[PDB]
């Protein structure tokens, strides 16, 4: 259960103060909803149900032409009001937003800056150098007191891997922050909407009315609203961190959220639409370099584990008993361990326990199998910290802090379990990563982000996605080989 993750952040029915929002129906461009501050930004009152005309909205022919083409987002520089206008499509609606235009900016200056970044990335000595250059560029153009790059781990915790700034905020470079600082619905949203900005932590939310959109009969889906009012609890987190403004940018690599470029200010601070879009572009450029590196490594590992797989599957088929493809020689046993980069394995077939390499005792495995028995396992169970959910395991963390466990073969109660040892390491966090407080029925963030150091115990080197896949495929192979052998 995750109460943080359950907040419906995409439907707050309000926006921040630095702009206004209008919802139009696609066919007619009839005004279906509006933020309470609309007439202010645009100088004309649009009653609900009324038809936007060119007199109200000088850009409406451009909006019309945009609507029916391919571009996902509308942009229009409304010089007269010094407003930047943006829009997106949602169902049968157009959601239109306006904000103050940038001052003293040009497309041509931003293009030269991004071109230089692209060229630098297109050589790119090293990823580290690519990350620092990208943070420095974003810092230069956004004017924020701090810009960092936040790299997500397999558990959705993250480490600060690059940083630039004015000195007005603390340094978090090299620190880890827990998964729960960005809850899963926020992570999902941030996968599909790559930009956000909070220019003043203490804005007063501006209501969107009417509450119910008459075209849809539901509340407004603000997933792609740039002005969307943000979660109260995140604002509390910002206050606790001492950041009066933020802006972040998703780094999306091969369709998955790789990390964030996160920016903060010690006082209120906004960034123009053109500069936000340039920061997205910068993140995309960086993502291309990251991808080169990520995919080469991943693919190489899959090739490697494929070779080991081919040998195991061949020996399993050639042997009288499939198990001897795993246990029947020194190469077989070495390959068994290498298949997932483990240091040990138990093959448990009914009452026969066969321990290979470095394992817990028979007695420890039997207890572990009883413990596993009581869970639903789709294909494989994997953990890098078995003591975490199975405390009796702390007694054998030196050999089996990490496990991949799975049922195998045609016999219920037969398992293949791979083991990894504890690897102790010192981990420095931005504050106590267990510190969330429950109060008035809600989970609140920690108050301190001061370096919080631990000697991490009972935790193995993490299981990679190629190692998990290889486990799944081995499992599939064992049963398919068996099935076919049985046809005879």
Ligand X SMILES: */C=C/C1=C(C)C(=O)N/C1=C\C1=NC(=C\c2[nH]c(/C=C3\NC(=O)C(C=C)=C3C)c(C)c2CCC(=O)O)/C(CCC(=O)O)=C1C
- In angstroms, what is the minimal distance from the CB of 423 to a copy of itself? 24
Q: Is 77 in the site for a copy of itself (CB under 8 A)?
A: yes
Return the number of the residue (189 or 316) whose C-beta is nearest ligand X: 189
Q: Is 314 in the site for a copy of itself (CB under 8 A)?
A: yes
Q: What count of other Cβ atoms lies within 10 Å of the Cβ of residue 480?
A: 11
Q: Which of 180, 205, 210, 268 binds ligand X (CB under 6 A)?
A: 180
Q: State the binding string over 425-444 for ligand X (x if CB under 6 A, else -).
A: -----------x------x-
Which positions from 230 through 269 interact with ligand X, judged by CB under 6 A? Answer: 230-231, 233-234, 237, 246, 248, 260, 262
Return the number of the residue (158 or 421) whose C-beta is nearest ligand X: 158
Which positions from 183 through 202 interact with ligand X, judged by CB under 6 A? Answer: 183, 186, 196, 198
303 binds, among ligand X, a copy of itself, Ca ion, none (CB under 5 to 8 A by kind): a copy of itself
The reply, when asked if residue 29 is annotated as ligand binding, is no
Q: Is 62 in the site for a copy of itself (CB under 8 A)?
A: yes
180 binds, among Ca ion, ligand X, a copy of itself, none (CB under 5 to 8 A by kind): ligand X
- In angstroms, what is the minimal distance from the CB of 65 to a copy of itself? 3
Alpha-carbon distance values, 193 to 110, 125, 131, 156, 189 (Å): 22, 30, 21, 18, 6
26 binds, among Ca ion, ligand X, a copy of itself, none (CB under 5 to 8 A by kind): none
Using DSSP bridges, classify how beta strands 93-100 and 19-25 pair: parallel, antiparallel or unpaired: antiparallel
Residue 210 to residue 108: CA distance in whole angstroms = 41
Tell me the window of 196-204, 259-267, 290-298, 366-374 that interacts with a copy of itself (CB under 8 A): 290-298
192 binds, among ligand X, Ca ion, a copy of itself, none (CB under 5 to 8 A by kind): none
Residue 87 to residue 457: CA distance in whole angstroms = 50
- In angstroms, what is the minimal distance from the CB of 426 to a copy of itself? 29
The reply, when asked if residue 419 is annotated as ligand binding, is no
Q: Is 296 in the site for a copy of itself (CB under 8 A)?
A: yes
Of 270, 274, 271, nearest to 108 (Cα)? 274
Tokens of 31: 């005004």
Return the number of the residue (105 or 151) whose C-beta is nearest Ca ion: 151
132 binds, among Ca ion, a copy of itself, ligand X, none (CB under 5 to 8 A by kind): none
Report whether 480 contacts 271 (CB < 8 A): no
Q: Is 162 in the site for ligand X (CB under 6 A)?
A: no
Tell me the window of 32-40, 90-98, 151-159, 223-231 that interacts with Ca ion (CB under 5 A): 151-159
Tell me the window of 96-104, 119-127, 174-182, 203-211 that interacts with a copy of itself (CB under 8 A): 119-127
Q: Is 182 in the site for ligand X (CB under 6 A)?
A: yes
Q: Is 181 in the site for ligand X (CB under 6 A)?
A: yes
Q: Which of 11, 26, 118, 468 binds a copy of itself (CB under 8 A)?
A: 118
Residue ranges of the annotated binding site for Mg(2+) are 151-152
> Footprint of a copy of itself on this chain (CB under 8 A)?
54, 58-62, 64-71, 75-77, 107, 111, 114-115, 118, 121-126, 281, 284-285, 288-289, 291-293, 295-297, 299-300, 303-304, 307, 310, 313-314, 316-318, 473, 476-477, 479-481, 483-485, 488
Residue ranges of the annotated binding site for Ca(2+) are 151-152
Residue ranges of the annotated binding site are 151-152
> Footprint of ligand X on this chain (CB under 6 A)?
4, 7, 9, 148, 150, 158, 160, 172, 177, 180-183, 186, 196, 198, 230-231, 233-234, 237, 246, 248, 260, 262, 436, 443, 445
């Amino acid at each position: 259960l995750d109460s943080c993750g359950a907040e419906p952040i995409h439907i707050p029915g309000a926006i921040q103060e630095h702009g206004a929002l209008l919802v139009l129906s696609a066919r007619e461009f009839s005004v279906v909803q509006a933020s309470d501050n609309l007439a202010n930004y645009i100088g004309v009152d649009l009653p609900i149900g009324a038809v936007a005309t060119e007199a109200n909205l000088p850009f409406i022919s451009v909006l019309s032409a945009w609507y029916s083409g391919a571009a996902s987002n509308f942009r229009y520089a409304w010089a007269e009001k010094k407003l930047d206008v943006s829009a997106h499509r949602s169902g049968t609606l157009v959601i239109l937003e306006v904000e103050k235009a940038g001052v003293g900016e040009s497309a041509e200056k931003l293009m030269g800056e991004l071109t230089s970044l692209a060229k630098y990335l297109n050589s790119a000595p090293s990823l580290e150098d690519a990350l620092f250059r990208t943070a420095q560029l974003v810092s230069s153009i956004s004017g924020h007191d701090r810009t960092l790059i936040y790299d997500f781990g397999l558990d959705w915790s993250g480490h600060v891997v690059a940083e630039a700034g004015s000195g007005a905020l603390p340094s978090y470079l090299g620190l880890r922050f827990p998964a729960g600082d960005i809850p899963p619905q926020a992570r999902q949203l941030y996968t599909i909407n790559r930009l956000r900005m909070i220019p003043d932590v203490d804005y007063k939310p501006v209501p969107i009315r009417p509450e119910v959109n008459a075209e849809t009969g539901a509340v407004l889906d603000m997933s792609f609203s740039q002005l969307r009012s943000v979660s109260p609890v995140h604002l509390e987190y910002m206050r606790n961190m001492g950041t009066a403004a933020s802006m972040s940018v998703s780094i999306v690599v091969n369709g998955a959220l790789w990390g964030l470029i996160a920016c903060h200010h010690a006082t209120p601070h906004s960034v123009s639409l053109a500069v936000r879009e340039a920061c997205d572009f910068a993140a995309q450029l960086l993502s291309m370099r990251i991808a080169m590196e990520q995919s080469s490594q991943d693919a190489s590992r899959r090739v490697e584990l494929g070779h080991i797989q081919a040998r195991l599957l061949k020996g399993m088929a050639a042997a009288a008993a499939w198990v001897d493809g795993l246990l029947g020689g020194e190469g077989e046993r070495e390959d068994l361990l290498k298949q997932v980069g483990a240091d040990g394995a138990a093959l448990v077939l009914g009452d026969d326990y066969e321990l290979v390499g470095n394992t817990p005792s028979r007695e420890q495995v039997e207890e572990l199998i009883l413990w596993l028995g009581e869970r639903e396992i789709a294909d494989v169970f994997a953990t890098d910290n078995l003591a975490g959910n199975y405390p009796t395991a702390a007694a054998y963390a030196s050999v089996a802090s990490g496990i991949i466990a799975m049922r195998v073969s045609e016999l219920h109660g037969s398992w293949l379990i791979w083991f990894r040892p504890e690897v102790i390491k010192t981990v420095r966090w931005g504050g106590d990563p267990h510190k969330t407080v429950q109060e008035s029925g809600r989970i609140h963030p920690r108050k301190s982000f001061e370096i919080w150091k631990e000697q991490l115990r009972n935790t193995s080197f993490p299981w990679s996605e190629p190692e998990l896949a290889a486990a799944r495929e081995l499992r599939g192979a064992i049963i398919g080989i068996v099935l076919r052998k049985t046809e005879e």
